[PDB]
Amino acid sequence: GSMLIKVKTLTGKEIEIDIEPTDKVERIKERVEEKEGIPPQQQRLIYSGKQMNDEKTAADYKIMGGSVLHLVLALRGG
Amino acid sequence: KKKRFEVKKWNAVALWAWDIVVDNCAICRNHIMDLCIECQANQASATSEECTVAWGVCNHAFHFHCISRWLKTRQVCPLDNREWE
Amino acid sequence: QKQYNVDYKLETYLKIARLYLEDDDPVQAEAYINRASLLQNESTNEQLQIHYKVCYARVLDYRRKFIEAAQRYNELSYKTIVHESERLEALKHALHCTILASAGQQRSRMLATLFKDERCQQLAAYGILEKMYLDR
Amino acid sequence: VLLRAVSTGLPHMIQELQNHIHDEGLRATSNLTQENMPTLFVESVLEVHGKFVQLINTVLNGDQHFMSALDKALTSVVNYREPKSVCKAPELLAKYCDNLLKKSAKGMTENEVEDRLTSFITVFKYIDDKDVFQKFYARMLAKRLIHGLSMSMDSEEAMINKLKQACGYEFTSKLHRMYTDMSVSADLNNKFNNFIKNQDTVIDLGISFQIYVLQAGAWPLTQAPSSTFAIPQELEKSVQMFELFYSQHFSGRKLTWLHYLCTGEVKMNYLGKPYVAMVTTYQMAVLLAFNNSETVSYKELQDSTQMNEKELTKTIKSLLDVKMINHDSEKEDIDAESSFSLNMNFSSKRTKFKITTSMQKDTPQEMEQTRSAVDEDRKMYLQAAIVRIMKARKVLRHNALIQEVISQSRARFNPSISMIKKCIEVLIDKQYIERSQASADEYSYVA
Ligand SMILES: [Zn+2]
Ligand SMILES: [Zn+2]
Ligand SMILES: [Zn+2]
């Protein structure tokens, strides 16, 4: 992964991940769940008060290294 | 008789809320002020302070499948201990 | 005008309640217990809370609301906190409702718990009902 | 001509136009607005309303960018003025209503008033604290409801139409039901005379039924404050027979108690004074506190106080100035050094009339009422910050969730640990987040 972004839970769990500048957040979800057991469909990716489309690229929302991919996510995985 | 401050004519007090709790059909808070999501979808005659408000046989004046919803969370409906309606 | 806290009014509610039940005017007391019902979120006096719970379940019996008090007395007498005399008394009223409540699948699983119940291994109609763990 | 065709020439003109329009708004909004009154406030800003209806209807005749621009900075200082209840001009507007919508004191003609009113409507795009103004205007109503700072009810009703179009909706009908409710106040005075025919006590005059229903939740703060009081027997009969009629009518709100309807009843009681010197509400209540005991220390009143003080400072001050008290201090209630007699003297026009002078003061009150606004604006800010979190990550737990919520807004203020439950509850209702099966805590996100 060329793009090293952060997937962040509601409590602030920002996770460092290697993705690409066109890497689908559809598969970024796959990455977050294959890494943290917390599955992505309650890792609801919201961008600035408005949801991130589960079927998009991270860089679609100018997401970068310290960017945030919102979970709101679950607790049992973690 | 020149002072003991006896009774003049006087003016009084009132309201009108209701003789019920009712707490906005607690199962959500699309209020009882509000036609909630499910019961804006169902919407009997329901208004900005009784979308459903009464000391009913339930007395849990809970929106149609919002009352059904918190009966979903427990089919024994102890909400006010009547089955979702 | 006079404000009481939960417990004095509540005292009167349970008082009214058990009284009319001794008088058997159940629905007046039903009116007022449903007024004392809601307060359950506020007061912490688990003692008097559950005095009120139990007059409720008494009513449920009186109301022919059998399973409801059945579930109540069942899960309530399951706990050692109560006078174990009074526990087994609720254990009666639970099972007395099990039988007085309809032939049920809730009741089937009830009766299954009751089969897994060890307390009633003392009891007489334990044996009776235990005959019927498999549909006697 | 040239920079419309020179086309970008114009946009620079609209630029520095926006600069002198704007900062002219800053100063001129800042200069004659020292007294902070409807005239200046409302008429300095509506004064520029003149400056640019007359500026811009003229030569001026198009660059609609000028339109959206003058509307833009005009709207901006519409939210950039002396408050932050910058409907203070709207406040002042209705306060203007207050000082003008009054049939006696500052009386005009409708369409004499209503010229001013349609100019208010001109601003109506810009009246911009509508529910700030609902809180504040329920207070205004507390200066209006029984009081009369709104003469032209139906001008206010068309204003209501405007609003419930683009503004608050049921505040309108709340005042409607209030209106018809004092209509019913007269009506049940009538029926009370019909039904009870209540010769309960010999002195039945004016014993209550005035009622002005704004919803119990329709009030800006708690009641017009009330406490213990004599309440002679007819007042009993009033509350109770009204409740006869009214429990017949409605139940759940009923004949509650509310002092600020109270006024003075000190008349031909048995007085060498021929005098009827009515007083304000707690003027009445505290003079009630001092009737028979021909003198009373701070301690004698302090026996049955169970209330606050300023009632009685207004009491002794109005009683000494008129010289209706043989007092010892005009203090908040009284010195223990000080005490209370009913003096006979009077200082005003009539047979001891116009002593009815509640001081009618708030600076200390202004701040007290400003407190209510903090709670409602913080709650709204929080509802949005909360739903937005709740959509992002579903926590979602109860306990851990609330803790994390605490983590996100460390800076803001100290919340209630309990009500954590309610917090999720609030989001459960909106279809924002649901309750999972797994725990009392640890729910799930929905929608
Ligand atoms: Zn709704
Ligand atoms: Zn309801
Ligand atoms: Zn439904």
Kindly state the tokens that stand for D252: 């759940």
Q: Is D109 helix (H, G, I), strand (E, B) or coil?
A: coil
Whole-angstrom Cα distance, residue D423 to residue D401?
A: 10
- Chain D residues within 8 A of B28 when measuring between CB atoms: 428-431
Q: Give the angle C75-C79-C85 at the CA atoms, nearest 5°.
A: 105
B80's CB contacts (< 8 A; 6+ apart) are B56, B58, B59, B60, C34, C37, C38
- Chain D residues within 8 A of B9 when measuring between CB atoms: 204-207
Asked whether the CA dihedral D123, D125, D128, D131 is positive or negative, the reply is positive
On whether any CB of chain D is under 8 Å from the CB of A46, the answer is yes
On whether any CB of chain B is under 8 Å from the CB of D223, the answer is no
Nearest chain D Cα to A51, which residue? D392
Alpha helix positions (H), D143-297: 153-166, 170-194, 233-249, 281-289
Resolution in A: 5.9
Q: Inter-chain contact C37–B55, Cβ cutoff 8 Å? A: no
Q: Inter-chain contact A72–D444, Cβ cutoff 8 Å? A: no
Distance from CA of B80 to the nearest CA of C (A): 7
Kindly state the tokens that stand for D137: 């205007």
Cis bond upstream, residue D123 (ω within 30): no
Half-sphere exposure of D292 (CA within 13 A, CB side): 1
Kindly state the tokens that stand for D427: 């989001």
Distance from CA of B81 to the nearest CA of C (A): 9
B-C CB pairs within 8 A amount to: 11
Distance from the Cα of residue D353 to its chain's centroid = 29
Q: Inter-chain contact D239–B11, Cβ cutoff 8 Å? A: no
Q: Inter-chain contact D269–B14, Cβ cutoff 8 Å? A: no
Q: Is D125 helix (H, G, I), strand (E, B) or coil?
A: coil
Long-range contact list for D36-40, CB < 8 A, 24+ apart? D36/D82, D36/D88, D37/D92, D38/D89, D38/D92, D38/D93, D38/D95, D38/D96, D38/D99
D43-56 helix and D9-31 helix, angle to the nearest 10 degrees: 160
Partner chains of A (3+ C-beta pairs under 8 Å)? D
Whole-angstrom Cα distance, residue B31 to residue B33?
A: 5
Whole-angstrom Cα distance, residue D343 to residue D223?
A: 32
* C-alpha of residue B35 to centroid of ligand 1, in Å: 5
Residue linked to tokens 């500026």:
D55
* C-alpha of residue B38 to centroid of ligand 3, in Å: 7
Beta carbons within 10 angstroms of residue D62's beta carbon: 10
Max CA-CA distance within chain D? Answer: 89
Kindly state the tokens that stand for B52: 């459903």
Long-range contact list for D48-56, CB < 8 A, 24+ apart? D48/D24, D48/D74, D49/D119, D49/D122, D49/D123, D52/D21, D53/D122
